[PDB]
Amino acid sequence: IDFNDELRNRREKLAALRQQGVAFPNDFRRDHTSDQLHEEFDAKDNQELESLNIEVSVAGRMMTRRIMGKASFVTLQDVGGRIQLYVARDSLPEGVYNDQFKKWDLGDIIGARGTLFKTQTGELSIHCTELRLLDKALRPLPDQEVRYRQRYLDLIANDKSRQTFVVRSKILAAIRQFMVARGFMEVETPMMQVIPGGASARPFITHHNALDLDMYLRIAPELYLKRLVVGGFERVFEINRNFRNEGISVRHNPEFTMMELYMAYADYHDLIELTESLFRTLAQEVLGTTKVTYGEHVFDFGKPFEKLTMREAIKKYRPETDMADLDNFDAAKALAESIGITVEKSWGLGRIVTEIFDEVAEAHLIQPTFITEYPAEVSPLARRNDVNPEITDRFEFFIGGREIGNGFSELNDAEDQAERFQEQVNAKAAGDDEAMFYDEDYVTALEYGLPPTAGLGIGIDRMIMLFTNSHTIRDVILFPAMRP
Amino acid sequence: IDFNDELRNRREKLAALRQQGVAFPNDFRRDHTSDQLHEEFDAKDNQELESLNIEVSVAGRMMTRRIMGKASFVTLQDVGGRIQLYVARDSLPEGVYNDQFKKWDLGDIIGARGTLFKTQTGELSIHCTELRLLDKALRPLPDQEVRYRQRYLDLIANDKSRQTFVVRSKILAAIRQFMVARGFMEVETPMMQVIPGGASARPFITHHNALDLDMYLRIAPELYLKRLVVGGFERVFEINRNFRNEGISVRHNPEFTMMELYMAYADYHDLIELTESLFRTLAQEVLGTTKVTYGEHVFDFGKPFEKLTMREAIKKYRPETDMADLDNFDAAKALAESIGITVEKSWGLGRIVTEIFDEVAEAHLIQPTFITEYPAEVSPLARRNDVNPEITDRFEFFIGGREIGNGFSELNDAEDQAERFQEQVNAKAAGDDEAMFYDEDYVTALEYGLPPTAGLGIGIDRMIMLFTNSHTIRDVILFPAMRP
Ligand SMILES: Nc1ncnc2c1ncn2[C@@H]1O[C@H](COP(=O)(O)OP(=O)(O)OP(=O)(O)OP(=O)(O)OC[C@H]2O[C@@H](n3cnc4c(N)ncnc43)[C@H](O)[C@@H]2O)[C@@H](O)[C@H]1O
Ligand SMILES: Nc1ncnc2c1ncn2[C@@H]1O[C@H](COP(=O)(O)OP(=O)(O)OP(=O)(O)OP(=O)(O)OC[C@H]2O[C@@H](n3cnc4c(N)ncnc43)[C@H](O)[C@@H]2O)[C@@H](O)[C@H]1O
Ligand SMILES: [Ca+2]
Ligand SMILES: [Ca+2]
Ligand SMILES: [Ca+2]
Ligand SMILES: [Ca+2]
Numbered sequence: 001i002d003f004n005d006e007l008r009n010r011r012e013k014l015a016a017l018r019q020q021g022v023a024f025p026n027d028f029r030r031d032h033t034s035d036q037l038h039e040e041f042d043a044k045d046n047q048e049l050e051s052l053n054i055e056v057s058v059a060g061r062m063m064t065r066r067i068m069g070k071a072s073f074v075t076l077q078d079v080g081g082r083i084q085l086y087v088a089r090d091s092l093p094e095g096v097y098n099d100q101f102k103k104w105d106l107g108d109i110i111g112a113r114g115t116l117f118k119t120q121t122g123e124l125s126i127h128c129t130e131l132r133l134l135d136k137a138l139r140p141l142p143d144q145e146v147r148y149r150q151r152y153l154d155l156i157a158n159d160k161s162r163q164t165f166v167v168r169s170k171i172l173a174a175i176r177q178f179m180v181a182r183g184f185m186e187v188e189t190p191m192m193q194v195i196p197g198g199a200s201a202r203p204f205i206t207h208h209n210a211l212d213l214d215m216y217l218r219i220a221p222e223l224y225l226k227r228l229v230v231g232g233f234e235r236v237f238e239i240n241r242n243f244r245n246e247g248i249s250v251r252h253n254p255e256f257t258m259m260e261l262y263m264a265y266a267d268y269h270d271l272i273e274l275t276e277s278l279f280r281t282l283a284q285e286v287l288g289t290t291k292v293t294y295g296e297h298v299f300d301f302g303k304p305f306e307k308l309t310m311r312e313a314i315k316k317y318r319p320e321t322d323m324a325d326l327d328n329f330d331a332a333k334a335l336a337e338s339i340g341i342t343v344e345k346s347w348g349l350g351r352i353v354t355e356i357f358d359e360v361a362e363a364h365l366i367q368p369t370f371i372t373e374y375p376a377e378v379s380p381l382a383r384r385n386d387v388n389p390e391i392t393d394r395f396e397f398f399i400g401g402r403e404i405g406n407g408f409s410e411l412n413d414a415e416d417q418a419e420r421f422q423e424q425v426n427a428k429a430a431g432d433d434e435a436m437f438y439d440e441d442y443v444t445a446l447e448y449g450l451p452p453t454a455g456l457g458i459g460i461d462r463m464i465m466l467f468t469n470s471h472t473i474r475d476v477i478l479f480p481a482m483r484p
Numbered sequence: 485i486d487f488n489d490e491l492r493n494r495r496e497k498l499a500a501l502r503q504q505g506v507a508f509p510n511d512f513r514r515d516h517t518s519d520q521l522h523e524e525f526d527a528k529d530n531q532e533l534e535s536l537n538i539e540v541s542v543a544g545r546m547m548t549r550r551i552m553g554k555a556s557f558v559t560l561q562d563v564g565g566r567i568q569l570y571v572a573r574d575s576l577p578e579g580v581y582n583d584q585f586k587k588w589d590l591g592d593i594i595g596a597r598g599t600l601f602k603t604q605t606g607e608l609s610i611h612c613t614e615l616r617l618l619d620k621a622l623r624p625l626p627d628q629e630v631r632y633r634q635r636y637l638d639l640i641a642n643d644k645s646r647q648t649f650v651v652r653s654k655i656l657a658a659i660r661q662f663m664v665a666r667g668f669m670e671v672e673t674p675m676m677q678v679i680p681g682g683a684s685a686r687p688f689i690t691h692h693n694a695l696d697l698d699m700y701l702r703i704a705p706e707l708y709l710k711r712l713v714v715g716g717f718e719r720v721f722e723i724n725r726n727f728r729n730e731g732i733s734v735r736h737n738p739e740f741t742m743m744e745l746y747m748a749y750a751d752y753h754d755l756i757e758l759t760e761s762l763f764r765t766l767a768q769e770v771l772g773t774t775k776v777t778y779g780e781h782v783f784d785f786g787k788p789f790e791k792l793t794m795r796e797a798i799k800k801y802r803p804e805t806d807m808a809d810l811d812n813f814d815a816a817k818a819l820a821e822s823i824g825i826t827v828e829k830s831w832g833l834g835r836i837v838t839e840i841f842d843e844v845a846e847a848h849l850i851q852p853t854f855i856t857e858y859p860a861e862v863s864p865l866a867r868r869n870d871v872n873p874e875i876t877d878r879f880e881f882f883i884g885g886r887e888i889g890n891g892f893s894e895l896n897d898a899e900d901q902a903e904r905f906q907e908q909v910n911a912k913a914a915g916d917d918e919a920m921f922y923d924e925d926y927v928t929a930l931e932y933g934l935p936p937t938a939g940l941g942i943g944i945d946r947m948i949m950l951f952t953n954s955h956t957i958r959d960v961i962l963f964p965a966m967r968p
């Protein structure tokens with residue numbers, strides 16, 4: 001009703017601008033943004049701003065306007081923030097005030113040129129000697145999911161989302177710097193693979209027409225990264241997007257940004273210290289402090305993370321459990337059923353134990369926590385432990401009740417890797433469509449030999465969630481997946 | 485072959501290492517890499533190295549060995565380069581030399597701990613007080629396509645490809661640094677879109693199971709990035725991978741790295757000077773000079789690039805052309821046929837002129853050259869010129885006979901964009917499967933209004949080709965697409 005009246009009115013105004021000339025001038029140039037004028041002239045008296053004649057030009061969206069009849073006050077908005085404009089009838093060229101400015105609408109992109117002063121409240125404002133219309137907005141300035149469908153409106157309105165994504169950029173940059181300072185080289189491994197691997201999930205399938213070849217979207221860079229380690233890049237990492245067919249969730253998006261790093265001649269303890277130093281560095285550089293407020297909790301990243309094994313977490317958060325039930329398939333299956341887990345025919349003992357850990361523990365790990373000693377069945381790419389060959393040297397890394405990152409001592413054994421891939425093929429035959437495939441090339445690389453290597457990966461979106469006080473992954477991803 | 489016999493021999497050795505204990509020790513740590521020891525102690529004679537007892541430990545692949553019977557010489561290779569080891573029988577623990585060292589094979593991953601000295605030739609060497617086998621290579625040390633299929637072998641053998649990809653990493657880092665210094669914010673936009681756009685090519689199609697939605701792989705970030713410029717991020721860029729269904733060519737890969745930047749309140753001339761400053765800066769920082777040797781040519785990036793229009797290039801590289809034939813559909817179609825272009829029913833006049841430019845000109849542009857004044861038919865997202873509504877303000881930027889990047893003043897007109905989208909849908913209906921789709925959401929964003937904006941994009945792989953003296957894109961991409 002009233003919205004379509006605005007649409008017709010503004011549309012007819014744009015058409016009138018077409019009538020008389022150029023309605024889309026691209027020639028306007030600005031020498032300043034609001035955040036710069038604030039970061040410089042915020043604390044200066046109107047006496048110093050009057051003696052120094054400082055002319056600036058800015059451009060942005062017109063957010064608010066108050067017309068007082070030959071003097072008007074405008075709120076202008078650009079990347080850095082808001083700056084205030086003083087629009088005077090007799091301080092502009094003839095007719096600009098009455099025949100142009102007063103006919104503009106909120107949301108139109110304009111630009112202004114004037115001298116700096118401060119109002120009676122001490123606010124920095126630009127007395128306008130020139131004002132003109134760069135673009136005419138056809139819709140006026142702006143349920144809970146509409147923020148995610150049209151993110152431009154969310155960015156225009158709420159500054160919390162703006163700060164969230166700016167913080168995301170700053171965090172990514174700080175991560176690249178923290179990795180480079182330690183001697184790691186950032187690479188680009190294929191995003192489209194013939195054989196997907198490196199994790200367990202449903203891959204996306206597409207078709208390459210020129211080669212008539214069905215290819216999968218990457219579920220993990222892992223195998224190609226370790227191939228590059230065989231090549232002799234012994235400190236390597238990739239921060240890039242992986243694709244999984246799983247589905248939408250608060251913690252899940254079909255395409256997400258992940259970091260995977262690998263350093264030779266190290267084990268997973270080095271990656272524990274590397275993780276703690278990573279979060280301490282991002283906490284100090286990105287925000288203010290090692291103490292980060294998240295929801296109803298406070299994370300202290302100057303404090304070492306809590307370390308537990310998987311069985312220690314199961315027994316910790318379910319003390320009534322008999323730990324002998326985890327040494328037998330039938331008792332473990334009965335236990336998992338008692339929790340409410342639906343067991344699959346393809347599941348072995350280790351998988352049942354791990355799922356029991358998922359239902360019992362994961363939701364209770366709030367403070368940052370490392371979970372170690374995973375079974376070999378659910379860790380096909382991880383190095384076997386020396387004392388207990390049925391478990392691998394591995395850890396998953398949890399913050400705020402969700403898995404953040406994953407790291408392990410990589411398995412450089414060729415025959416063992418091939419055999420566990422065989423097990424994964426058997427599992428895929430048994431109905432588990434998240435199971436990996438058999439990759440013969442990676443086995444060949446391991447036969448050319450892979451130095452003892454540790455490797456880590458971290459879902460970046462989860463991390464930025466933790467640092468922005470954002471409780472949904474949709475708040476931290478610019479254009480997440482929707483449900484039409 | 486004799487290769488398989490040695491392979492079985494190494495496998496038997498590895499099994500013997502399983503028999504007597506741990507065959508995959510991960511506990512060895514190194515405090516130095518070869519490039520560090522070279523960057524420090526290369527300038528010191530054996531007199532200074534004798535007074536200072538400097539003990540270092542290194543680890544890496546054993547490339548060469550000469551066993552002289554209680555004295556041996558080993559070349560060790562790691563990330564930073566090669567370093568030489570002096571393995572003495574009586575300088576190691578008992579049995580290490582005879583029962584272990586002499587049984588190792590070339591390519592095995594080892595580690596050494598010793599004191600620094602210089603041989604009679606001045607070579608920096610590590611006298612080994614300890615040596616042990618970290619990983620046992622099951623296959624011995626290694627043109628055509630083998631380099632591309634197995635890249636660990638290429639990186640192990642050829643030191644040229646190594647520093648090719650290292651130069652790639654350093655270039656990418658320098659590009660992010662060069663963009664951040666100018667106020668651009670790096671951004672992540674979807675890799676999977678419901679409606680692909682921003683370019684013309686066959687997209688990859690896949691299926692999301694949870695949403696029962698068929699989705700396309702990104703052919704360009706453009707639409708989402710400009711959406712974010714509407715949101716108020718007025719300097720944005722994305723360096724990330726785009727997917728197109730094309731084929732394997734010298735200049736083509738199905739998945740390739742792209743940079744797309746957008747700055748509001750600017751036109752394409754600002755992007756021309758931005759590009760020249762970009763290549764001059766990268767050339768000075770990475771290669772130490774403005775003059776870059778590529779093949780048989782020398783590019784000078786301290787020199788401004790050559791500027792031509794499209795018709796000026798058609799007439800320059802085909803002077804017998806009558807430029808009136810490009811103003812009429814039948815004359816232009818007959819002309820393109822005379823060149824050998826196969827015209828399609830969906831092609832209009834501007835398309836014919838652009839394809840004539842491609843056949844006549846592109847292969848002849850060796851020195852960096854800007855080509856301006858593109859027709860609106862092949863530039864649906866570009867702002868129309870003021871004097872000639874049938875052409876748009878746009879340029880494509882060529883080096884070494886290939887296209888590198890393209891940039892234009894973006895089209896902020898909503899109705900015009902809608903109409904050009906309509907024409908692209910008509911083109912798809914007319915048989916052209918590279919034509920775009922109709923994106924209603926982007927039109928909606930343009931109706932919320934997009935400030936006057938200029939935008940650019942650059943194939944990164946082509947650029948790294950120019951800076952590595954690589955004449956195929958396969959040399960500059962770690963794992964390119966192969967033919968099974
Ligand atoms: N489709 C779904 N819908 C609803 N609930 C689901 C779900 N899938 C799992 N869950 C929940 O998770 C619990 C246990 O299932 P898991 O499969 O073990 O947990 P996960 O969160 O999916 O981590 P995963 O192990 O699979 O990824 P990876 O380390 O290889 O990779 C390393 C890092 O990558 C990140 N990551 C993985 N998948 C991601 C995704 N779709 N989106 C964003 N980040 C992701 C993670 O931070 C991870 O740490 C379940 O009980 C369930 O509640
Ligand atoms: N599959 C094929 N096989 C054999 N010959 C072929 C071929 N395709 C084209 N050719 C030859 O090239 C000539 C001209 O064709 P064009 O289509 O005009 O040249 P192009 O290299 O394909 O640039 P394009 O137009 O597609 O990219 P865009 O501006 O959107 O902007 C994207 C930017 O990113 C880069 N880029 C685009 N696609 C890329 C890819 N697969 N790999 C690496 N970089 C790519 C580019 O620098 C580009 O500027 C043809 O006559 C033909 O001889
Ligand atoms: Ca999962
Ligand atoms: Ca898990
Ligand atoms: Ca995991
Ligand atoms: Ca193309």
Ligand SMILES: [Ca+2]
Nearest residue numbers: 838839842862
């Ligand atoms: Ca073209």
Ligand SMILES: [Ca+2]
Nearest residue numbers: 880887889890
């Ligand atoms: Ca092009």
